[PDB]
Amino acid sequence: PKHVLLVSEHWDLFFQTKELLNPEEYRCTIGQQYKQELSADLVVCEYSLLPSFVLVLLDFFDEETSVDLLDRGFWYLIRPITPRILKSAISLFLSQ
Amino acid sequence: PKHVLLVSEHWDLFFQTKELLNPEEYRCTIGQQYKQELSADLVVCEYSLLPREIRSPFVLVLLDFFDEETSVDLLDRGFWYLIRPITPRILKSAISLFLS
Ligand code: NA
Ligand code: NA
């Protein structure tokens, strides 16, 4: 099982997403801070909490923010997001 | 070099993006309709020009608006997307992200 670390202040979205992922293919850890101490195949992380592969969650679009994330090698999703969207992005990313 | 196919009815964004790409690393083609015909490393396609029946088996789809079902549908078909607003800098960095 691929290891997925999900970092955010709030956890509803992430709990629901975890319930949606196949438990034989993905194992989730949830945090309120990006602990670079934890090994993970993919980190999903709120932008405000950003210090492996990382998918960044943004509240709003901003060109310079977006350009910098992509140059650093991070894909991003801009709100609004749903558990189904986040589950599908995690699957797509890990399978690719 | 990598091959990027660009499918759109409004070519200005794409024109400006090619100008920013290093021509020794990337060769571009731009069209108004989606051709499975061409082999490319990455396809950037406007959603309105994306055939409904296709999926993969890189494709980046460009959306005007957010719609949840549409976003879930694209990701399940194996396509990443970008919602507007979009700029040439954003497009260039995305292309490089995928192909690096
Ligand atoms: Na499921
Ligand atoms: Na699960």
Side-chain angles (χ1 to χ4, degrees), chain A residues 20-40:
Chain A
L20 261 37
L21 289 159
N22 179 333
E24 308 279 328
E25 300 169 332
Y26 312 95
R27 180 87 55 106
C28 295
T29 297
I30 322 266
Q32 286 180 291
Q33 281 188 358
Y34 184 3
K35 50 273 300 177
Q36 320 86 311
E37 298 201 353
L38 211 38
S39 217

PDB file of all heavy atoms in Angstrom, chain A residues 20-40:
ATOM      1  N   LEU A  20     -12.861   6.962   1.217  1.00  0.00           N
ATOM      2  CA  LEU A  20     -13.043   6.716  -0.210  1.00  0.00           C
ATOM      3  C   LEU A  20     -11.886   5.936  -0.837  1.00  0.00           C
ATOM      4  O   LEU A  20     -12.085   5.240  -1.790  1.00  0.00           O
ATOM      5  CB  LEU A  20     -13.259   8.037  -0.968  1.00  0.00           C
ATOM      6  CG  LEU A  20     -14.693   8.458  -1.338  1.00  0.00           C
ATOM      7  CD1 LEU A  20     -15.707   8.114  -0.280  1.00  0.00           C
ATOM      8  CD2 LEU A  20     -14.796   9.933  -1.700  1.00  0.00           C
ATOM      9  N   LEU A  21     -10.668   6.054  -0.333  1.00  0.00           N
ATOM     10  CA  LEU A  21      -9.551   5.353  -0.978  1.00  0.00           C
ATOM     11  C   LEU A  21      -9.577   3.831  -0.732  1.00  0.00           C
ATOM     12  O   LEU A  21     -10.042   3.367   0.292  1.00  0.00           O
ATOM     13  CB  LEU A  21      -8.214   5.969  -0.542  1.00  0.00           C
ATOM     14  CG  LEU A  21      -7.868   7.378  -1.069  1.00  0.00           C
ATOM     15  CD1 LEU A  21      -6.818   8.053  -0.194  1.00  0.00           C
ATOM     16  CD2 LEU A  21      -7.398   7.346  -2.498  1.00  0.00           C
ATOM     17  N   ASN A  22      -9.110   3.043  -1.681  1.00  0.00           N
ATOM     18  CA  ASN A  22      -9.007   1.604  -1.465  1.00  0.00           C
ATOM     19  C   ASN A  22      -7.986   1.324  -0.343  1.00  0.00           C
ATOM     20  O   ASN A  22      -6.821   1.664  -0.479  1.00  0.00           O
ATOM     21  CB  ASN A  22      -8.608   0.940  -2.792  1.00  0.00           C
ATOM     22  CG  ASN A  22      -8.435  -0.573  -2.685  1.00  0.00           C
ATOM     23  OD1 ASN A  22      -8.115  -1.107  -1.630  1.00  0.00           O
ATOM     24  ND2 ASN A  22      -8.636  -1.260  -3.796  1.00  0.00           N
ATOM     25  N   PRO A  23      -8.426   0.727   0.783  1.00  0.00           N
ATOM     26  CA  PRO A  23      -7.495   0.506   1.902  1.00  0.00           C
ATOM     27  C   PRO A  23      -6.370  -0.510   1.608  1.00  0.00           C
ATOM     28  O   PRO A  23      -5.370  -0.560   2.331  1.00  0.00           O
ATOM     29  CB  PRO A  23      -8.409  -0.007   3.021  1.00  0.00           C
ATOM     30  CG  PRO A  23      -9.548  -0.690   2.278  1.00  0.00           C
ATOM     31  CD  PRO A  23      -9.762   0.149   1.044  1.00  0.00           C
ATOM     32  N   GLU A  24      -6.518  -1.313   0.561  1.00  0.00           N
ATOM     33  CA  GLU A  24      -5.445  -2.236   0.190  1.00  0.00           C
ATOM     34  C   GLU A  24      -4.378  -1.548  -0.665  1.00  0.00           C
ATOM     35  O   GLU A  24      -3.250  -2.025  -0.745  1.00  0.00           O
ATOM     36  CB  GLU A  24      -6.001  -3.455  -0.565  1.00  0.00           C
ATOM     37  CG  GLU A  24      -7.155  -4.163   0.139  1.00  0.00           C
ATOM     38  CD  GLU A  24      -6.696  -5.123   1.234  1.00  0.00           C
ATOM     39  OE1 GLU A  24      -5.594  -5.710   1.101  1.00  0.00           O
ATOM     40  OE2 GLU A  24      -7.445  -5.291   2.228  1.00  0.00           O
ATOM     41  N   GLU A  25      -4.731  -0.434  -1.304  1.00  0.00           N
ATOM     42  CA  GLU A  25      -3.789   0.279  -2.166  1.00  0.00           C
ATOM     43  C   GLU A  25      -3.221   1.567  -1.546  1.00  0.00           C
ATOM     44  O   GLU A  25      -2.162   2.044  -1.955  1.00  0.00           O
ATOM     45  CB  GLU A  25      -4.427   0.587  -3.523  1.00  0.00           C
ATOM     46  CG  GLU A  25      -4.875  -0.652  -4.287  1.00  0.00           C
ATOM     47  CD  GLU A  25      -5.737  -0.325  -5.497  1.00  0.00           C
ATOM     48  OE1 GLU A  25      -6.417   0.725  -5.479  1.00  0.00           O
ATOM     49  OE2 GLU A  25      -5.732  -1.119  -6.471  1.00  0.00           O
ATOM     50  N   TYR A  26      -3.914   2.123  -0.565  1.00  0.00           N
ATOM     51  CA  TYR A  26      -3.480   3.369   0.053  1.00  0.00           C
ATOM     52  C   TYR A  26      -3.617   3.314   1.561  1.00  0.00           C
ATOM     53  O   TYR A  26      -4.639   2.881   2.082  1.00  0.00           O
ATOM     54  CB  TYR A  26      -4.295   4.563  -0.475  1.00  0.00           C
ATOM     55  CG  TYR A  26      -4.419   4.593  -1.978  1.00  0.00           C
ATOM     56  CD1 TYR A  26      -5.527   4.042  -2.607  1.00  0.00           C
ATOM     57  CD2 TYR A  26      -3.420   5.142  -2.769  1.00  0.00           C
ATOM     58  CE1 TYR A  26      -5.651   4.053  -3.977  1.00  0.00           C
ATOM     59  CE2 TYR A  26      -3.530   5.146  -4.155  1.00  0.00           C
ATOM     60  CZ  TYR A  26      -4.652   4.602  -4.749  1.00  0.00           C
ATOM     61  OH  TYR A  26      -4.786   4.602  -6.127  1.00  0.00           O
ATOM     62  N   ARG A  27      -2.588   3.778   2.261  1.00  0.00           N
ATOM     63  CA  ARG A  27      -2.656   3.913   3.704  1.00  0.00           C
ATOM     64  C   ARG A  27      -2.473   5.384   4.036  1.00  0.00           C
ATOM     65  O   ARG A  27      -1.514   6.012   3.589  1.00  0.00           O
ATOM     66  CB  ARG A  27      -1.558   3.069   4.379  1.00  0.00           C
ATOM     67  CG  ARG A  27      -1.536   3.145   5.912  1.00  0.00           C
ATOM     68  CD  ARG A  27      -2.475   2.126   6.520  1.00  0.00           C
ATOM     69  NE  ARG A  27      -2.168   0.775   6.047  1.00  0.00           N
ATOM     70  CZ  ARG A  27      -1.568  -0.166   6.774  1.00  0.00           C
ATOM     71  NH1 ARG A  27      -1.216   0.080   8.034  1.00  0.00           N
ATOM     72  NH2 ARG A  27      -1.328  -1.362   6.240  1.00  0.00           N
ATOM     73  N   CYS A  28      -3.383   5.931   4.827  1.00  0.00           N
ATOM     74  CA  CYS A  28      -3.372   7.355   5.121  1.00  0.00           C
ATOM     75  C   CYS A  28      -2.847   7.669   6.519  1.00  0.00           C
ATOM     76  O   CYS A  28      -3.103   6.949   7.472  1.00  0.00           O
ATOM     77  CB  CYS A  28      -4.777   7.949   4.957  1.00  0.00           C
ATOM     78  SG  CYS A  28      -5.429   7.898   3.267  1.00  0.00           S
ATOM     79  N   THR A  29      -2.092   8.755   6.615  1.00  0.00           N
ATOM     80  CA  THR A  29      -1.756   9.353   7.887  1.00  0.00           C
ATOM     81  C   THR A  29      -2.248  10.784   7.786  1.00  0.00           C
ATOM     82  O   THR A  29      -2.171  11.383   6.719  1.00  0.00           O
ATOM     83  CB  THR A  29      -0.235   9.317   8.131  1.00  0.00           C
ATOM     84  OG1 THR A  29       0.193   7.957   8.205  1.00  0.00           O
ATOM     85  CG2 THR A  29       0.131  10.018   9.436  1.00  0.00           C
ATOM     86  N   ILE A  30      -2.809  11.312   8.865  1.00  0.00           N
ATOM     87  CA  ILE A  30      -3.297  12.690   8.881  1.00  0.00           C
ATOM     88  C   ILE A  30      -2.547  13.515   9.924  1.00  0.00           C
ATOM     89  O   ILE A  30      -2.338  13.066  11.046  1.00  0.00           O
ATOM     90  CB  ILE A  30      -4.792  12.753   9.221  1.00  0.00           C
ATOM     91  CG1 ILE A  30      -5.539  11.588   8.577  1.00  0.00           C
ATOM     92  CG2 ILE A  30      -5.388  14.124   8.840  1.00  0.00           C
ATOM     93  CD1 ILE A  30      -6.138  11.883   7.254  1.00  0.00           C
ATOM     94  N   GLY A  31      -2.166  14.734   9.558  1.00  0.00           N
ATOM     95  CA  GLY A  31      -1.436  15.604  10.459  1.00  0.00           C
ATOM     96  C   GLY A  31      -1.906  17.041  10.401  1.00  0.00           C
ATOM     97  O   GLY A  31      -2.671  17.421   9.514  1.00  0.00           O
ATOM     98  N   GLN A  32      -1.462  17.847  11.359  1.00  0.00           N
ATOM     99  CA  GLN A  32      -1.737  19.279  11.308  1.00  0.00           C
ATOM    100  C   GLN A  32      -0.480  20.037  10.923  1.00  0.00           C
ATOM    101  O   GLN A  32      -0.495  21.244  10.786  1.00  0.00           O
ATOM    102  CB  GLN A  32      -2.304  19.785  12.630  1.00  0.00           C
ATOM    103  CG  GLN A  32      -3.745  19.374  12.838  1.00  0.00           C
ATOM    104  CD  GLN A  32      -4.319  19.876  14.139  1.00  0.00           C
ATOM    105  OE1 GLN A  32      -3.926  19.429  15.210  1.00  0.00           O
ATOM    106  NE2 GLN A  32      -5.266  20.807  14.054  1.00  0.00           N
ATOM    107  N   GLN A  33       0.617  19.321  10.735  1.00  0.00           N
ATOM    108  CA  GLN A  33       1.837  19.974  10.298  1.00  0.00           C
ATOM    109  C   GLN A  33       2.605  19.033   9.402  1.00  0.00           C
ATOM    110  O   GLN A  33       2.576  17.823   9.595  1.00  0.00           O
ATOM    111  CB  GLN A  33       2.704  20.392  11.497  1.00  0.00           C
ATOM    112  CG  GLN A  33       2.246  21.665  12.200  1.00  0.00           C
ATOM    113  CD  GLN A  33       3.244  22.136  13.262  1.00  0.00           C
ATOM    114  OE1 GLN A  33       4.268  21.489  13.503  1.00  0.00           O
ATOM    115  NE2 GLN A  33       2.946  23.266  13.898  1.00  0.00           N
ATOM    116  N   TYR A  34       3.311  19.579   8.424  1.00  0.00           N
ATOM    117  CA  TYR A  34       4.118  18.713   7.584  1.00  0.00           C
ATOM    118  C   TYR A  34       5.377  18.286   8.323  1.00  0.00           C
ATOM    119  O   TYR A  34       6.351  19.036   8.421  1.00  0.00           O
ATOM    120  CB  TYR A  34       4.455  19.352   6.232  1.00  0.00           C
ATOM    121  CG  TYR A  34       5.215  18.419   5.324  1.00  0.00           C
ATOM    122  CD1 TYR A  34       5.484  17.112   5.713  1.00  0.00           C
ATOM    123  CD2 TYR A  34       5.660  18.832   4.082  1.00  0.00           C
ATOM    124  CE1 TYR A  34       6.187  16.244   4.893  1.00  0.00           C
ATOM    125  CE2 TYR A  34       6.364  17.966   3.250  1.00  0.00           C
ATOM    126  CZ  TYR A  34       6.624  16.677   3.667  1.00  0.00           C
ATOM    127  OH  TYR A  34       7.321  15.809   2.853  1.00  0.00           O
ATOM    128  N   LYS A  35       5.326  17.065   8.846  1.00  0.00           N
ATOM    129  CA  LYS A  35       6.466  16.431   9.482  1.00  0.00           C
ATOM    130  C   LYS A  35       7.313  15.722   8.431  1.00  0.00           C
ATOM    131  O   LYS A  35       6.927  14.663   7.929  1.00  0.00           O
ATOM    132  CB  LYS A  35       5.998  15.436  10.550  1.00  0.00           C
ATOM    133  CG  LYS A  35       4.922  14.455  10.081  1.00  0.00           C
ATOM    134  CD  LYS A  35       3.518  15.033  10.245  1.00  0.00           C
ATOM    135  CE  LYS A  35       3.222  15.361  11.704  1.00  0.00           C
ATOM    136  NZ  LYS A  35       1.865  16.005  11.867  1.00  0.00           N
ATOM    137  N   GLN A  36       8.459  16.317   8.096  1.00  0.00           N
ATOM    138  CA  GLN A  36       9.370  15.744   7.112  1.00  0.00           C
ATOM    139  C   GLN A  36      10.044  14.532   7.729  1.00  0.00           C
ATOM    140  O   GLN A  36      10.968  13.957   7.157  1.00  0.00           O
ATOM    141  CB  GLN A  36      10.431  16.755   6.670  1.00  0.00           C
ATOM    142  CG  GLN A  36       9.933  18.187   6.475  1.00  0.00           C
ATOM    143  CD  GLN A  36       9.931  18.993   7.773  1.00  0.00           C
ATOM    144  OE1 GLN A  36       9.428  18.532   8.804  1.00  0.00           O
ATOM    145  NE2 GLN A  36      10.504  20.199   7.728  1.00  0.00           N
ATOM    146  N   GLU A  37       9.577  14.159   8.914  1.00  0.00           N
ATOM    147  CA  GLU A  37      10.115  13.008   9.621  1.00  0.00           C
ATOM    148  C   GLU A  37       9.407  11.757   9.152  1.00  0.00           C
ATOM    149  O   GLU A  37       9.916  10.645   9.300  1.00  0.00           O
ATOM    150  CB  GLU A  37       9.928  13.169  11.130  1.00  0.00           C
ATOM    151  CG  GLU A  37      10.655  14.361  11.725  1.00  0.00           C
ATOM    152  CD  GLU A  37      10.874  14.212  13.222  1.00  0.00           C
ATOM    153  OE1 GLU A  37      10.334  13.246  13.807  1.00  0.00           O
ATOM    154  OE2 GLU A  37      11.588  15.054  13.812  1.00  0.00           O
ATOM    155  N   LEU A  38       8.223  11.947   8.582  1.00  0.00           N
ATOM    156  CA  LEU A  38       7.412  10.837   8.103  1.00  0.00           C
ATOM    157  C   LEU A  38       7.693  10.573   6.628  1.00  0.00           C
ATOM    158  O   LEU A  38       7.686  11.493   5.810  1.00  0.00           O
ATOM    159  CB  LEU A  38       5.936  11.162   8.313  1.00  0.00           C
ATOM    160  CG  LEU A  38       4.927  10.048   8.582  1.00  0.00           C
ATOM    161  CD1 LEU A  38       5.503   8.955   9.474  1.00  0.00           C
ATOM    162  CD2 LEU A  38       3.671  10.644   9.201  1.00  0.00           C
ATOM    163  N   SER A  39       7.950   9.314   6.300  1.00  0.00           N
ATOM    164  CA  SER A  39       8.126   8.893   4.920  1.00  0.00           C
ATOM    165  C   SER A  39       6.754   8.707   4.271  1.00  0.00           C
ATOM    166  O   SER A  39       5.825   8.189   4.896  1.00  0.00           O
ATOM    167  CB  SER A  39       8.917   7.579   4.856  1.00  0.00           C
ATOM    168  OG  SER A  39       9.789   7.555   3.736  1.00  0.00           O
ATOM    169  N   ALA A  40       6.628   9.126   3.015  1.00  0.00           N
ATOM    170  CA  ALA A  40       5.351   9.064   2.324  1.00  0.00           C
ATOM    171  C   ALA A  40       5.568   9.036   0.827  1.00  0.00           C
ATOM    172  O   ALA A  40       6.484   9.674   0.314  1.00  0.00           O
ATOM    173  CB  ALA A  40       4.476  10.255   2.705  1.00  0.00           C
TER     174      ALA A  40
END
